[PDB]
Amino acid sequence: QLTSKIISKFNYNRLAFQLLLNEAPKKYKVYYIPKRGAGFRVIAQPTKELKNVQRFIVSLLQPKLPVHHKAMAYEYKKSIKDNALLHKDNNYILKMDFQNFFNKIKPDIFFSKLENTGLKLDSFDENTLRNLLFWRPGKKRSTTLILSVGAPSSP
DNA sequence: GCGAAAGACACAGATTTCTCCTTCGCATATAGGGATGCGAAGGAGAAATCTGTGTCTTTCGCAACCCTAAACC
- Residue A129 one-letter amino acid: L
Q: Which residues pair with A34 in a beta bridge?
A: A40
Length of chain A: 155
**Residues whose CB is less than 8 angstroms from the CB of residue A26 and which lie 6 or more positions away in sequence, other chains included:** A136, A140
Q: In the structure, how far is the CA atom of residue A70 from the C1' atom of nucleotide B32, in angstroms? A: 119
What span, in angstroms and rounded, lies between the C-alpha atoms of A100 and A85? Answer: 28
What span, in angstroms and rounded, lies between the C-alpha atoms of A142 and A126? Answer: 20
* H or E segment to which residue A84 belongs: helix A80-84
Nucleotide whose C1' lies closest to the alpha carbon of residue A145: B1
Query: Which of A135, A153, A127, A154 shows the shortest CA–CA distance to A54?
Result: A153
**CB–CB of A153/A57 below 8 Å?**
yes
Q: What is the resolution of this structure in A?
A: 3.1
**CB–CB of A117/A65 below 8 Å?**
yes
Query: Which of A12, A29, A23 shows the shortest CA–CA distance to A151?
Result: A29
What span, in angstroms and rounded, lies between the C-alpha atoms of A4 and A126? Answer: 14
**CB–CB of A43/A150 below 8 Å?**
yes
What span, in angstroms and rounded, lies between the C-alpha atoms of A102 and A110? Answer: 13
A52 touches strand B (CB under 7 A): no
Nucleotide whose C1' lies closest to the alpha carbon of residue A47: B64
Strand B bases with any atom < 7 A from protein Cβ: 1-3, 60-66, 71-73
Method in brief: cryo-EM
What span, in angstroms and rounded, lies between the C-alpha atoms of A122 and A124? Answer: 5
A39 touches strand B (CB under 7 A): no
Instruction: Report angle CA A123, A125, A130 to the nearest 5 degrees.
Output: 95
A13 sits in the region (left: phi over 0; alpha: psi -120 to 50; else beta) called beta
* H or E segment to which residue A127 belongs: helix A123-132
Nucleotide whose C1' lies closest to the alpha carbon of residue A42: B61
Nearest 5°: phi and psi at A9? Answer: -70, -45
Instruction: Report angle CA A16, A19, A24 to the nearest 5 degrees.
Output: 120
